[PDB]
A paper describes a structure:
Translocations of MLL in hematopoietic cells result in fusions comprising the N-terminal domain of MLL and a C-terminal region encoded by myriad partner genes.
Based on these conserved properties, we designed an E. coli expression construct and purified the AF6 RA1 domain (residues 37–136). RAS and AF6 crystallized with 1:1 stoichiometry, and RA1 adopted the predicted ubiquitin fold topology. Superposition of our AF6-RAS structure with RASSF5-RAS demonstrates the position of this auxiliary helix (designated αN).
Author numbering:
A (entry chain A): -1 to 168
B (entry chain B): 38 to 48, 56 to 83, 90 to 117, 121 to 132
Write the structure that this text describes.
């Protein structure tokens, strides 16, 4: 119908696949090396549910030593892609810490999010699919299993977030 | 030797930890590999007072902390 802009912020622990997911969506390319991110920004225009969406994607730092100005980009963000790795139970538990910080920045319980489980191409799963479903349903957000190595669910994860941002777009 | 974070704009935005010893050539090659593998670019400091190009042996981290200067580093390409 109309042109819309969405500010997506990718959020999660280090080595979880935040950069690899974002680069897959922007460049259709999988990054191999593990380069710890500080704050990376991207812009890409797509069509979601029959409307052109200007997506402004902000890939953020997972390492706490690289995440100084977290409060400022959590203010500017409209939706949050909370990524964990299914082979890393620690990054799954950190999700609640990111969840609460985002609710404190926006100061509301109604913050659009999408829970993302990455590295689904690996067989060494330590987080079952139902564990994340309980956490997602307890938050009231969708859960998407993605693989940045094979592009699985990458488009669905970001597009679902856009649909989650529309629910609170005024 | 110390490290600091620097923001770079290009046409979209990257913040990276840069060494006190990193030259402009190393920074450009780092930014080029971060978005275009198989790696000619130039780095500019931009203020409201004017623009200026950094030399190859120059250290952008030391240039940054030399700034009443809302300067911004920009990566550019002649292509
Ligand atoms: N098998 C597999 N490896 C992945 C996947 N996504 C990322 N990786 C790998 O995991 C490592 C971390 O990737 P990265 O995107 O840097 O994670 P990050 O969340 O951005 N890290 P940081 O928080 O430091 O910026 C890299 O070696 C990358 O190749 C995935 O879906 N599957
Ligand atoms: Mg990264």
């Amino acid at each position: 119908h109309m042109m819309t802009e969405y500010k997506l912020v990718v959020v999660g622990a280090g080595g979880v696949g935040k950069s690899a997911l974002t680069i897959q969506l922007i460049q259709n390319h999988f990054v191999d090396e593990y380069d710890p991110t500080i704050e990376d920004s991207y812009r890409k225009q797509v069509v979601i549910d029959g409307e052109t969406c200007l997506l402004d994607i902000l890939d953020t730092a997972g390492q706490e030593e690289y995440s100084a100005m977290r409060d400022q980009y959590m203010r500017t963000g409209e939706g949050f892609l909370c990524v964990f790795a299914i082979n890393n139970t620690k990054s799954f538990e950190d999700i609640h810490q990111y969840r609460e910080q985002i609710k404190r920045v926006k100061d509301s319980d109604d913050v659009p999010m999408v829970l993302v489980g990455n590295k689904c191409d690996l067989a060494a799963r330590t987080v079952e699919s139902r564990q994340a479903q309980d956490l997602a349903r307890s938050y009231g957000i969708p859960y998407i299993e993605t693989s940045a190595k094979t592009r699985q669910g990458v488009e669905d994860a970001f597009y679902t977030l856009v649909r989650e941002i529309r629910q609170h777009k005024l | 030797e110390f490290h600091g974070v620097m923001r770079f704009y290009f046409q979209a935005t990257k913040c990276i930890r840069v060494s006190s010893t990193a030259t402009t050539q190393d920074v450009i090659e780092t930014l080029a590999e971060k978005f275009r593998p198989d790696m000619k670019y130039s780095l500019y400091e931009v203020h409201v007072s004017g623009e200026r190009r950094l030399d190859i042996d120059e250290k952008p981290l030391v240039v940054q902390l030399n700034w009443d200067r809302e300067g911004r580093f920009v990566l550019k390409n002649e292509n």
